[PDB]
Amino acid sequence: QRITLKDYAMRFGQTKTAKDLGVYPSSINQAIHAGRKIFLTINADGSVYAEEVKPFPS
Amino acid sequence: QRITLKDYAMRFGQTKTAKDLGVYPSSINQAIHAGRKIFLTINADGSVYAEEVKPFPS
């Protein structure tokens, strides 16, 4: 099902995570450290859909 | 049995790996990137024994 950003990066590595999410490695690293609740869905076509769940208001 | 340095760091994290090996995180990171063949034995008392296998001469 959905995979946490942290678990994904551990499994697939920082480079692949960054490229799959369209961001720089620093963005991945910072979001993991921040403890943001980010969940990744691996799509059949190899694309990866990342979303964040956070309290409102920010 | 023995665990690779890379797998250990993935499992236990960079901080714990560094402190268990008595080095700075940068030393762990550099050795993983270098692809050095480093193997860790988890001892019963919680100490961790790391050794490197490398061609001779260096």
Reading the block at residue A50, the tokens are 């990342």
How far, in Å, CA of B14 to CA of B16, rounded? 6
Which secondary-structure segment (H or E) carries B8? helix B5-12
- CB-facing half-sphere around the CA of A51: CA atoms within 13 A: 5
Residues contacting residue A45 through CB under 8 Å, at least 6 positions apart? none
Query: DSSP letter string over B22-43?
Result: TS-HHHHHHHHHHT-EEEEEE-
Reading the block at residue A13, the tokens are 């590595």
User: Strand order in B37-42's β-sheet?
Assistant: B3-4, B37-42, B48-53
Give the resolution value in Å.
1.4
How far, in Å, CA of B18 to CA of B2, rounded? 17
How far, in Å, CA of A8 to CA of B10, rounded? 11
Which secondary-structure segment (H or E) carries A34? helix A25-34
Please state which architecture CATH assigns to domain B1-58.
2-Layer Sandwich (3.30)
Contacts 24+ apart (CB under 8 A), B25-30: none
Token pair 């969940």 is found at A39
Beta strands per DSSP E along A1-58:
3-4, 37-42, 48-53
**Secondary structure letter of residue A44 according to DSSP:** T
Residues contacting residue B7 through CB under 8 Å, at least 6 positions apart? none
- CA distance from start to end of chain A: 26
Instruction: Give the start-to-end residue ranges of the domains of chain A.
Output: 1-58
Reading the block at residue A34, the tokens are 């921040």
